[PDB]
């Protein structure tokens, strides 16, 4: 019996089989319907037909907000991508911490009542990433398309009072890039154009080590500019947008949020932990998720945490090269262990206890 591991990101589904070193199916967590108002398309194929569809994400900031479309995503994952019968596979799902409890209750209900899985578990994403890095103690910064979260973990146990969450992540950065590109006279507005700008962001953006210095460099000459060919063949140029876009992670006021930036959420999380473990957290800051892939982000985090921390504190940022998939990989490892599977909810347990059982089994 092979378990399935499905990391349902706000932006991307990562799905596959426990024991594999990578997800075999990675595709956009989108449902598309005709822009002019069968009847819908899912995932890669919706992306392929983007020219005629309006695209919608069923997960916003880590929370499922369109359950009918989420069911379409899960159905597509099992039957069209992985081509498995879900009733034959114990299934590991994932979630951001600090989600409302009803989200995993309904996940559990649909997995058992609609998909008839034999067993399932919902794991916290940051814990999977820490194990994927070979650690039991550290502080994870996970940033995807919907959520940025910090989870300090000591001896294998997440410290709930110190968990931090910011509902600011890759989708907000894409939207901000769309906005600032209007300053050059470009107009990216539609759901299809959002996906184009997402690609520009992924290919060309970076985190400046010193933002104000970089702004001056960009005005002094064209040395930082890059060009990009749109699907219609138009070639555009971008300059300081390359680094102003992810600067938002450090300065959330760029999009009108009063929140602390990611360097400050990380520091604040460490400071909520018992004094004697803080050195181990500072030395084990593990980054995971696609929004941690900007060139320069680890060096900027190192610099900013150094400025906040005690002057003698040893600080290390760990940035695994495959960190777009670290959550999934940690799930593949844990779901390969019989003792971890012993904790999973079985179909019989669900039949007898209902959705509330998820809170008593999944930690």
């Amino acid at each position: 019996t092979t378990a399935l591991v499905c990391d349902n990101g706000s932006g991307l589904v990562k799905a596959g089989f426990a024991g594999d070193d990578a997800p075999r199916a990675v595709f956009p967590s989108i449902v598309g319907r005709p822009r002019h108002q069968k009847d819908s398309y899912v995932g890669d194929e919706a992306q392929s037909k983007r020219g005629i569809l309006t695209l919608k994400y069923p997960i916003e900031h880590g929370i499922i907000t369109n359950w009918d479309d989420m069911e379409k995503i899960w159905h597509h994952t099992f039957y069209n991508e992985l081509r498995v019968a879900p009733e034959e596979h114990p299934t590991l799902l994932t979630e951001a911490p600090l989600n409302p409890k009803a989200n995993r209750e309904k996940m559990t209900q649909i997995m058992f009542e609609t998909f008839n899985v034999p067993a399932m578990y919902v794991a916290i994403q940051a814990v999977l990433s820490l194990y994927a890095s070979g650690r039991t103690t550290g502080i994870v910064l996970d940033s995807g398309d919907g959520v940025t979260h910090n989870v300090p973990i000591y001896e294998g146990y997440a410290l709930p009072h110190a968990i931090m969450r910011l509902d600011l992540a890759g989708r907000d950065l894409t939207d901000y890039l769309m906005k600032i590109l209007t300053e050059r006279g470009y107009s990216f507005v539609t759901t299809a154009e959002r996906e184009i700008v997402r690609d520009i962001k992924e290919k060309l953006c970076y985190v400046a080590l010193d933002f104000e210095n970089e702004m001056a460099t960009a005005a002094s000459s064209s040395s930082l500019e890059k060009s990009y060919e749109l699907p219609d063949g138009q070639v555009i140029t971008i300059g300081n947008e390359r680094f102003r876009c992810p600067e938002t992670l450090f300065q959330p006021s760029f999009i009108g949020m009063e929140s602390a930036g990611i360097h400050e959420t990380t520091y604040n999380s460490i400071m909520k932990c018992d004094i004697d473990i803080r050195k181990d957290l500072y030395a084990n800051n593990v980054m995971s998720g696609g929004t941690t892939m900007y060139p320069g982000i680890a060096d900027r985090m190192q610099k900013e945490i150094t400025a906040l921390a005690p002057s003698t504190m040893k600080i290390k940022i760990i940035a695994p090269p495959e960190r777009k998939y670290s959550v999934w990989i940690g799930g593949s490892i844990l779901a390969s262990l019989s003792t971890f599977q012993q904790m999973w909810i079985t179909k019989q347990e669900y039949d007898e206890a209902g959705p509330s059982i998820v809170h008593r089994k999944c930690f």
């Binding site: 070193d21 989600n99 294998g156 262990l337």
Partner: protein
Amino acid sequence: YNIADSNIANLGTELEKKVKLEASQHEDAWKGAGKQVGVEIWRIQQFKVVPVPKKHHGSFYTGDSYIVLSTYHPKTNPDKLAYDVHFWLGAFTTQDEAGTAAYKTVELDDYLGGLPVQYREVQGYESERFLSLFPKGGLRILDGGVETGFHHVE
């Protein structure tokens, strides 16, 4: 947020510890562990926790990951047992081995009631405590190791 309304409301609870203690009862490697002073060692082999024979204790394959349980009498009571649990990660170990070693270290900690203090020991970064476990000349690194448990997705 509102922790009590959220999916982390039961973290840190007695219930979390109870469920994890139960899971740890399902690993054969822990049966009989930590019952007398000494050092017990296991190697991860394709996701499984496999005992290392005593005659090899102190010799570690650079390609592998291990769990080392050191049982000792604490200063507080010469007739009771306390524990340091070290997980040793060879310079060439693969991600599945190191992640399993980490998870299973927590599980052994659970099995022993939380008492073990955990130490992550990367080859070349071993702590003073780890270096003190083996008699002079006892700590030796060996070339090679067992094959990963992962299937490589092409």
